[PDB]
Symmetry: C2
Subunit: 123 residues, 2 copies
């Protein structure tokens, strides 16, 4: 329930309620592709700050047009993250309950290691 109509005071306070509700759950500094691309846009903005506050057309095609692609790529990538771990979870959960013997434990571990190894390879 947060909005940019709100004054800075209230956003900053909500920004800390949010940062703490996140901290245990979300792995820290994992949205770094996004944080990065945001820092470049912001640098381009500070750069020509007074060039932008008088020129809506430049601002739109140079700054917020890039914000438009960021928000899209964020959603896409987050969307695929969620699918990924869910897929991994639905693959592993039933296998773990099929481990009934040491040999099956070994077969499981080899299976996990292979997923791991190829996950990290194809990147």
């Amino acid at each position: 329930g947060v909005s940019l109509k709100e004054d800075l005071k209230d956003l900053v306070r909500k920004a800390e309620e949010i940062g703490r509700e996140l901290s245990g759950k979300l792995k820290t500094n994992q949205l770094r592709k996004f944080h990065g691309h945001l820092t470049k846009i912001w640098s381009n903005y500070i750069y020509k700050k007074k060039d932008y506050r008088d020129n809506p057309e430049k601002f739109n095609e140079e700054i917020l047009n890039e914000l438009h692609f960021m928000k899209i790529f964020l959603a896409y990538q987050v969307g695929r993250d969620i699918e990924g771990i869910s897929e991994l979870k639905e693959i592993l959960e039933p296998l773990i309950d099929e481990i009934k013997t040491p040999d099956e434990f070994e077969k499981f571990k080899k299976f996990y290691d292979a997923i791991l190894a190829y996950h990290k390879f194809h990147s």
Copy 2:
């Protein structure tokens, strides 16, 4: 689509496919604490391997029991990872929608700085 009764080989073929798929979706270390619990259980088993392979009861109560906690813990972790990242994205997305002006931009940036900061603050 996968079972431990399949032979070790047809399993690592399937693992290859799953791993390959996950490379385009998942960033590469989402299950660190899970991977860690696993290897700990695995190294426990390997360390007293002969003993475990000779006493099914000991294997059941010391390895299979822990693997069951691991299975429960994976659900919990994946669930938290998903709602963590989904929540942040659902806070960022609509705010980025609302950025139409320089003032709105720098107000966003300030909120984002604050989220990021009160987010790293708690580990």
